[PDB]
């Protein structure tokens, strides 16, 4: 757990991509900017490619 959060990305029936982030960090996922709040929740939830973002603290997976 070097970063607080894991953002999971669900597209086409599976999570095949996950990204790390600290709370209140903005990361990039493909071309898109994602903001991750103090509860590890990502904004926006639905990326423009209709993929679905989900997050939580690292230990909860």
């Amino acid at each position: 757990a070097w970063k607080d959060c894991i953002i999971q990305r669900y597209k086409d029936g599976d999570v095949n991509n996950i990204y790390t982030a600290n709370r209140n960090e903005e990361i990039t996922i493909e071309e898109y900017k994602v903001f991750v709040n103090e509860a590890c929740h990502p904004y926006p939830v639905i990326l423009p490619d209709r993929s679905v973002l989900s997050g939580d603290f690292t230990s909860a997976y």
């Binding site: 757990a1 070097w2 894991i6 999971q8 599976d14 999570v15 095949n16 991509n17 996950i18 990204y19 790390t20 990361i27 690292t58 997976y61």
Partner: protein, 73 residues
């Protein structure tokens, strides 16, 4: 900015999810991806990743972990 590719024994979706989370836990990892026609390769991308420690962790928890490639990017 290194890209690291790892064969991991992850035969079902629950182990693909465990491996994804496990690689992500390692210092310097920004992203982890599942690739290969048999859903058995992790592409780990970050900065300053210790790839020996990465593969050892996946090996300890998934049984098999082979370091296929490290590459600048």
């Amino acid at each position: 900015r290194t890209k690291i590719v790892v064969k991991v024994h992850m035969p079902c979706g629950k182990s693909r999810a465990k491996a994804l989370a496990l690689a992500a836990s390692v210092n310097g990892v920004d992203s982890v991806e599942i690739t290969g026609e048999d859903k058995d390769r992790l592409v780990v991308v970050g900065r300053g990743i210790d790839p020996v420690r990465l593969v050892a962790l996946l090996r300890e928890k998934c049984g098999l972990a082979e370091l296929l490639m490290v590459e600048l990017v």
